[PDB]
Amino acid sequence: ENLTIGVFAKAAGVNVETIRFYQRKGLLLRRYGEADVTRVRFVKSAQRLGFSLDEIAELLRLEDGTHCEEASSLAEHKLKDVREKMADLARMEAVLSELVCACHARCPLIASLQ
Amino acid sequence: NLTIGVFAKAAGVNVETIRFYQRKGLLLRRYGEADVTRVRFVKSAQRLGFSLDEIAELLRLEDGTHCEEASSLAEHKLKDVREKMADLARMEAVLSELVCACHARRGNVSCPLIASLQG
Ligand SMILES: [Hg+2]
Ligand SMILES: [Hg+2]
């Protein structure tokens, strides 16, 4: 059926503040139905995979599910970015671990920073 | 002693970065070796992921006689790095999975990425 702002949110499993947030950023479109629910879960899911608000708008451009080549591309690009970020964080984790190890085994941290 | 440009060269960083560091007040119109050492301190820390605030705290311990307190900042940072990696890893796993299914889609079936984003 059609639904009020509060029931919409309940059906979509999200805060009312989040529905409003999504409306102001224009990731949506009185009352609401199942397409709206599905649309909100679309956004929330994508957001959770690390897509930016902009990237999600592009992704929604392809919502009718007949542009697979273009969809993969957004995901593959995001994946590339994720992997770079992980490779950087990994480089930090390695050195930080190494510094701590030397801290406990004694200031080497400061020494190494200089 | 050294000019803005040579300072940066000696410190192995952009001029924009020296200025950046001055405006945020992590520094000490000439410059010398303490300034160089101080900039390498910041740049290094920044490269290990320390925030500008965390670096100010870390600089409080610059004389190298507060090992307990230093480790703590590093250990806390290390925890945060690992969390972030664990989150990114979660994304990477599902995204990889979606792409794999994108490339593998059969005939005229609807886009799995979108499908998964709606289910
Ligand atoms: Hg796809
Ligand atoms: Hg230490």
Numbering used by the authors:
A (entry chain A): 6 to 34, 44 to 120, 126 to 133
B (entry chain B): 7 to 34, 44 to 134
The paper states:
The mer operons are under the regulation of the mercury(II)-dependent transcriptional repressor-activator MerR. Thus, in the absence of mercury(II), MerR still represses the transcription of the structural genes by capturing RNA polymerase in a closed inactive state. Upon mercury(II) binding, the conformation changes of MerR induce a local underwinding of the promoter DNA, which facilitates the formation of an open complex by RNA polymerase to initiate transcription. MerR is a representative metalloregulatory protein that exhibits high sensitivity and selectivity to mercury(II) in vivo and in vitro.
Here we report the crystal structure of the C-terminally truncated Tn501 MerR in complex with mercury(II). The mercury(II)-bound Tn501 MerR was crystallized as a functional dimer in an asymmetrical unit of the P3121 space group. Each monomer contains three distinct functional domains comprising an N-terminal DNA-binding domain (DBD, residues 1–81), a C-terminal metal-binding domain (CBD, residues 119–134), and an amphipathic dimerization helix (DH, residues 82–118). The long dimerization helix plays a critical role in stabilizing the dimer by the formation of an antiparallel coiled-coil dimer interface. In the functional dimer of Tn501 MerR, there are two mercury ions bound at the equivalent site. However, only one metal-binding loop in the MerR dimer is fully ordered. In Tn501 MerR, the bounded mercury(II) shows planar trigonal coordination geometry with the S-atoms from three conserved cysteine residues (Cys82, Cys117, and Cys126). The Hg–S bond length in the mercury(II)-cysteine complex is consistent at ~2.56 Å, and the largest S-Hg-S angle is at 127°. The angular deviation from the perfect 120° may be caused by a steric effect derived from the pyrrolidine of Pro127, which is packed above the Hg-SCys117 and Hg-SCys126 bonds. The Gly79 residue in the corresponding hinge region participates in hydrogen-bonding interactions not only with residues Ser125′and Cys126′ of the metal-binding domain from the other monomer, but also with residue Glu77 adjacent to the C-terminus of the α4-helix.
